[PDB]
Amino acid sequence: VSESFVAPLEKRAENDVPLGNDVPIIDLQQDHLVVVQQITKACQDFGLFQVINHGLPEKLMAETMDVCKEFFALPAEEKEKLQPKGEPAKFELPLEQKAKLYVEGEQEAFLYWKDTLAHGCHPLDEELVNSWPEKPATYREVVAKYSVEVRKLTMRILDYICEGLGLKLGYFDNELSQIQMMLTNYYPPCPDPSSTLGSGGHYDGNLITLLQQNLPGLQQLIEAKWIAVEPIPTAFVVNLGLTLKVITNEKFEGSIHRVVTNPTRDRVSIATLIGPDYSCTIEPAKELLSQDNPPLYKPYSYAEFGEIYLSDKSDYDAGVKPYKIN
């Protein structure tokens, strides 16, 4: 493997990470109060859970995975059309909503063993969709339907979260969820998995993420122990973001997770990252604060947070360290 992709010794994954048997799998077709209670407990104790019987069509999930895999099978000459000035874009502000191919890593500088297609999905209009990939031919039709369905499911989950916290329904149905970035991640086979990472350990910086996977590689950090997240092809993995950790005043955990490489087979995952506009002010929900529950963060600019989150990887929560109080 090229030295560009060699992770620092301490960040390298061990070869036998055990299955996370305690990862909650929440059936959304249970009684309403049972769903609210199970989601609440998962958010409080884990910050990562799976949802099943979630009302998003299984056929649409399969068609979206198909067209995402078809995109990454396109030849070089087509993929160049999504590389600004001949190279992949970087996860840095301003983060534009038009489709680009992205490179990612840490600055002992190294790169993640990953190609990422990213674009905005909300609101859907002619201008946004016309900035999506031209190939495959059905990408725009399928991903337009997928993005609406994934948003619908995310807003259902956020309203379950509202009921669990004692916030009014629709608390997050505003500026706090106005950005919907869809990241299609391609992990080609890696000749030295012991030295590389598909994706470094991170919180998602946004509010909430729904992740679709059909192959192993996703791992979560629990009380410095890593566990493997079982791939369920018809489920969504829910990762609570650093923004939700702040707004709930740490009553909810954020999901710290990474992706390991595979020597023999490729892997495609689809992450829908919903969260605030860059103009937003983030603070602990006033409605939940008291003398017994004082705010642990001061108000901050999401744009200012974003710049630190995307550059400083000295700690998982480096993004919010400057805003910590009490």
Ligand X SMILES: CN1[C@@H]2CC[C@H]1C[C@@H](OC(=O)[C@H](CO)c1ccccc1)C2
Under 8 Å between Cβ of 267 and 209: no
State how far the alpha carbon of 299 is from the alpha carbons of 62, 159, 322, in Å.
41, 23, 11
> Looking at 1, 6, 95, 124, which residue binds ligand X (CB under 6 A)?
95
Q: Which is nearer to ligand [O], 206 or 262 (CB)?
A: 206
Under 8 Å between Cβ of 91 and 104: yes
Residues in the interface with ligand X (CB under 6 A) total: 16
* 309 counts as binding ligand X under rule CB under 6 A: yes
* Interacting residues toward Sr ion by CB under 5 A: 83, 86, 130
Distance in Å, CB of 9 to ligand [O], minimum: 24
269 is in an annotated binding site: yes
Picking from 105, 161, 156, 119, the residue whose alpha carbon sits closest to that of residue 272 is 119
Q: Which is nearer to ligand [O], 159 or 204 (CB)?
A: 204
Q: Which is nearer to ligand X, 7 or 35 (CB)?
A: 7
Backbone angles phi, psi at 283, to 5 degrees: -155, 160
Binding at 20: pick from ligand X, Sr ion, V ion, none (beta carbon under 5-8 Å per type): none
> Looking at 13, 204, 219, 260, which residue binds ligand X (CB under 6 A)?
204
| 67-72: long-range contacts, CB 8 A cutoff, minimum separation 24 | 67/136, 67/138, 67/139, 67/142, 67/143, 68/117, 68/184, 68/268, 68/270, 69/268, 70/136, 70/139, 71/117, 71/133, 71/135, 71/136, 71/139, 71/184, 72/115, 72/117, 72/184, 72/186, 72/266, 72/268
204 is in an annotated binding site: yes
d(C-alpha 291, C-alpha 3), whole Å? 52
Distance in Å, CB of 85 to Sr ion, minimum: 9
* 104 counts as binding V ion under rule CB under 5 A: no
- Binding residues for ligand [O] restricted to 201-230, rule: CB under 6 A: 204, 209
- Binding residues for V ion restricted to 188-247, rule: CB under 5 A: 204
* 271 counts as binding ligand [O] under rule CB under 6 A: yes
Both structure tokens of 8: 């620092």
Q: Which residue number places its CB atom closest to V ion? A: 204
> Looking at 147, 206, 219, 261, which residue binds ligand X (CB under 6 A)?
206
199 is in an annotated binding site: no
Residues in the interface with ligand [O] (CB under 6 A) total: 3
Q: Which is nearer to ligand [O], 78 or 307 (CB)?
A: 307
Q: Which is nearer to ligand [O], 11 or 135 (CB)?
A: 11
Q: Which is nearer to ligand [O], 71 or 102 (CB)?
A: 102
- Contacts with V ion, residue ranges (CB under 5 A): 204
- Contacts with ligand [O], residue ranges (CB under 6 A): 204, 209, 271
Residues annotated within the binding site for Fe(2+) are 202, 204, 257
